[PDB]
Amino acid sequence: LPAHLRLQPIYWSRDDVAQWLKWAENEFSLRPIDSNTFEMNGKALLELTKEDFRYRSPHSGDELYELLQHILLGKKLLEAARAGQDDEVRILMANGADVNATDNDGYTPLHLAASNGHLEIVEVLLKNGADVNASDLTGITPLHAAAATGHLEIVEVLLKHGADVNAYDNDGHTPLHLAAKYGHLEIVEVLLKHGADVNAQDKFGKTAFDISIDNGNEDLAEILQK
Numbered sequence: 001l002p003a004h005l006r007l008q009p010i011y012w013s014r015d016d017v018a019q020w021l022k023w024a025e026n027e028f029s030l031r032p033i034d035s036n037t038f039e040m041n042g043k044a045l046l047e048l049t050k051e052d053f054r055y056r057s058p059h060s061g062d063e064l065y066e067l068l069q070h071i072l073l074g075k076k077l078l079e080a081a082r083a084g085q086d087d088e089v090r091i092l093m094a095n096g097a098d099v100n101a102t103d104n105d106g107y108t109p110l111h112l113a114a115s116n117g118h119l120e121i122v123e124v125l126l127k128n129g130a131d132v133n134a135s136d137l138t139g140i141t142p143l144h145a146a147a148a149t150g151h152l153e154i155v156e157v158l159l160k161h162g163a164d165v166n167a168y169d170n171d172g173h174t175p176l177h178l179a180a181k182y183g184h185l186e187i188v189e190v191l192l193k194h195g196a197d198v199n200a201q202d203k204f205g206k207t208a209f210d211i212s213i214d215n216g217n218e219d220l221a222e223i224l225q226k
């Protein structure tokens with residue numbers, strides 16, 4: 001994955017800017033432009049106006065400018081969701097921020113609010129079209145994240161909004177496996193009531209029951225047996 005897709009633009013080097021232009025030409029089917037159309041770094045790109053972009057690229061400048069704004073607003077929303085800043089989330093969405101923006105790990109605002117326990121933000125994102133089943137780079141969904149971190153009310157809201165109870169990540173772990181690993185008995189019970197496959201096996205040959213034993217969560221193993 002190229003640097004410019006892994007960094008916020010304020011950190012892009014001069015070379016990153018050139019690579020971004022070439023990436024955008026292909027991603028957005030734009031008229032080709034010379035790699036030196038913007039002889040500057042990312043911090044400099046952020047100083048230019050839309051009119052400056054249009055001057056430098058008559059065919060694509062407006063698009064390029066708006067792609068950068070999309071990244072900036074997306075990052076503010078990710079950070080506001082992570083930090084539980086309900087008011088900032090509200091302002092950013094009213095300002096058009098992408099509710100399905102992703103960070104360097106594939107985490108969306110919904111992933112971050114779910115992982116950090118911010119129930120009101122989870123609810124507002126879902127009401128406004130956040131993808132309840134978005135999968136990060138390793139296959140983790142918002143439901144995995146809420147289950148692993150012990151946020152029962154969020155688990156319930158995600159399930160009510162259509163979260164896949166049996167989604168599996170790159171290691172074959174379902175939300176049930178993660179709840180078992182971290183000892184979250186009440187979450188295990190909710191997942192089971194919503195159709196979690198108690199017999200799902202991870203890439204290491206283990207079920208949730210095995211994981212619960214391995215982690216000393218004997219109360220969970222009890223619930224899983226019966």
Ligand SMILES: [Cl-]
Pocket residue numbers: 069072
């Ligand atoms: Cl700006």
Ligand SMILES: [Cl-]
Pocket residue numbers: 069070071072073074075096097098101
């Ligand atoms: Cl955005």
Ligand SMILES: [Cl-]
Pocket residue numbers: 199200201202
């Ligand atoms: Cl399985």
Ligand SMILES: [Cl-]
Pocket residue numbers: 166167168172174200201
């Ligand atoms: Cl599975």
Ligand SMILES: [K+]
Pocket residue numbers: 102106107108134135136137
């Ligand atoms: K994602």
